[PDB]
Amino acid sequence: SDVSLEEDREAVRREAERQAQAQLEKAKTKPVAFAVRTNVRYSAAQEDDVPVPGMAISFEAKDFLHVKEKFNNDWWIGRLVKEGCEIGFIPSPVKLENMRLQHEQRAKKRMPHTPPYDVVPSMRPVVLVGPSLKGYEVTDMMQKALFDFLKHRFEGRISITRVTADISLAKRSVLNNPSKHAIIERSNTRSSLAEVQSEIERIFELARTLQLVVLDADTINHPAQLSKTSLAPIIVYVKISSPKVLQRLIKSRGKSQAKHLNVQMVAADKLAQCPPQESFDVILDENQLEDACEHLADYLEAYWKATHPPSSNLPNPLLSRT
Amino acid sequence: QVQLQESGGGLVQAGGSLRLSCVASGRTFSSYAMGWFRQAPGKEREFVAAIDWSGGTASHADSVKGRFTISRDNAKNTVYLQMNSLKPEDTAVYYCAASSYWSRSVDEYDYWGQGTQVTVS
Ligand SMILES: [Ca+2]
Ligand SMILES: [Mg+2]
């Protein structure tokens, strides 16, 4: 019968879904392989042909995904990095491309691009900026107090490392430059970009096991210095809101620090000009150090939960017939 | 995509600065992460370097960090492996492979090239 045959095509589909779901269960206990930050929105639709229908992972632009396994050339297995989100099927760049083409063909100018995923560290590295320039006593003493608090508050979960190399250079215009200039600089084994590239791979490796990564980055005084990299940092703005208060603080450190007053005041003003919601992930402008520490810890504990979801319950073997 | 031609180069004794180059067909090059592998005359294929879709992230093998550097031009559908300071341990056939995934594993790559021979004495 023609009906009994559609029953076969449906049963084949159900068996394919059962096998895909079984592979999803096996991945629940595998480690996070890598992470990506998205550049586009993906809203799961009814014709997406997901390996298990209804288990597609929808996401917004600039979301973060933890990837555990490659299912096939069209789908990965992973989860949105967000509390309460469980693993499902993430469309690959190959699949994301073909879906956009289908959307444009059914859409209603006279003449009728960007990669959706960037590989980023599995944990977003924490970077402190402000109140002024690093290397001077006011900023160094304030950031050191926050670093000392993070060591104790997150002991056993934290990996703090110093970065003296200018990781602001770790962008495509520098590290992936195709001009005949770079082709010659890559020939010298002592090109300054070698240590920059090496430091980036070390930061990725430090976050692979999902520990909280905190960078003491010497050269990063402004979020625009990392926005073009693939480090996707958590930018913590240590803020002194009153320029006059910052002046007394700098002047209170002696003439050695009062000499470089203008360069410190200018940098603090540059941070104040940043649109806060696009530039900073955490803004610490509390009056007391203890209150600023609690704010930062609250944020990182929430990030820890988003990156360390509880283990899913295993099916009770008592319910099995054999 | 389905066709990967690795221009590359020949062999040297030591030192050296060879810019291997693999060209791809089709306007889906930006949809694939690109990696370089190598197979010594008597050894298994091993990972050398990989670069992601937009070219913003690169990973190099421990045996090759600093000496070799991968890059890509998505306007020319090409990927390179700048090889500097060459050693006998670098004698291998160099393969370039595309993946819809981020990986350093041979099984998780979707398309593979023909291969380019290099030798260091
Ligand atoms: Ca104060
Ligand atoms: Mg779905």
Side-chain angles (χ1 to χ4, degrees), chain A residues 42 44-45 50 52-57:
Chain A
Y42 162 62
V50 194
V52 180
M55 293 298 270
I57 301 302

Side-chain angles (χ1 to χ4, degrees), chain A residues 47-285:
Chain A
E47 300 192 63
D48 286 359
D49 193 22
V50 194
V52 180
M55 293 298 270
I57 301 302
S58 287
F59 54 79
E60 282 284 337
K62 298 315 168 176
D63 278 345
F64 292 82
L65 308 169
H66 271 182
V67 184
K68 288 195 174 203
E69 167 170 321
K70 177 189 185 188
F71 179 75
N72 57 20
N73 287 353
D74 285 344
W75 296 96
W76 308 344
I77 292 169
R79 61 180 291 269
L80 192 50
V81 180
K82 159 171 330 180
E83 283 189 62
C85 292
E86 289 152 327
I87 57 161
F89 291 97
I90 293 163
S92 84
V94 166
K95 179 72 176 182
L96 281 173
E97 184 36 12
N98 309 346
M99 299 194 302
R100 172 171 74 55
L101 276 49
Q102 297 162 177
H103 275 357
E104 85 184 2
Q105 263 165 261
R106 72 179 195 180
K108 179 155 183 182
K109 287 306 190 57
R110 58 218 306 102
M111 64 316 300
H113 188 261
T114 171
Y117 296 143
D118 297 340
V119 177
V120 295
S122 297
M123 300 285 279
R124 294 175 63 190
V126 174
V127 172
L128 311 190
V129 297
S132 186
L133 284 174
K134 292 168 187 171
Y136 301 91
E137 280 190 356
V138 170
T139 296
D140 287 356
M141 278 180 324
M142 272 190 199
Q143 293 198 358
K144 175 185 181 311
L146 293 166
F147 285 137
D148 291 348
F149 165 82
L150 290 178
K151 288 181 217 211
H152 302 322
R153 180 50 80 82
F154 293 93
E155 159 175 45
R157 303 183 281 158
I158 187 144
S159 299
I160 313 200
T161 184
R162 169 96 167 267
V163 182
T164 52
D166 190 6
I167 48 169
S168 82
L169 288 172
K171 52 182 176 185
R172 305 167 180 84
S173 50
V174 175
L175 282 192
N176 195 54
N177 155 36
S179 70
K180 302 287 150 285
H181 205 37
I183 307 159
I184 295 183
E185 318 304 327
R186 296 193 194 100
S187 307
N188 173 32
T189 181
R190 340 169 92 101
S191 172
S192 66
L193 305 175
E195 185 171 327
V196 171
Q197 174 66 33
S198 161
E199 280 294 273
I200 298 294
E201 301 195 33
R202 181 174 76 90
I203 290 162
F204 274 76
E205 174 58 26
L206 205 63
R208 182 183 48 86
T209 58
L210 304 186
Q211 299 283 273
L212 272 174
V213 176
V214 183
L215 310 180
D216 182 12
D218 285 2
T219 72
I220 304 304
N221 289 300
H222 192 290
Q225 294 172 307
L226 286 184
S227 59
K228 291 181 180 179
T229 80
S230 289
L231 286 173
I234 289 165
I235 297 284
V236 178
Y237 181 15
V238 190
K239 184 178 193 188
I240 293 288
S241 307
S242 171
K244 351 309 172 183
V245 172
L246 180 63
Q247 185 148 3
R248 333 209 272 261
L249 281 191
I250 284 161
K251 279 168 168 283
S252 99
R253 301 309 307 180
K255 267 103 181 53
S256 69
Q257 307 284 320
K259 169 40 182 293
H260 329 274
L261 172 67
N262 299 136
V263 75
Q264 280 175 93
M265 293 303 294
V266 167
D269 178 64
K270 288 278 163 203
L271 290 171
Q273 300 180 28
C274 291
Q277 54 293 315
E278 292 111 288
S279 315
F280 312 113
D281 303 279
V282 188
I283 297 187
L284 305 180
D285 61 352

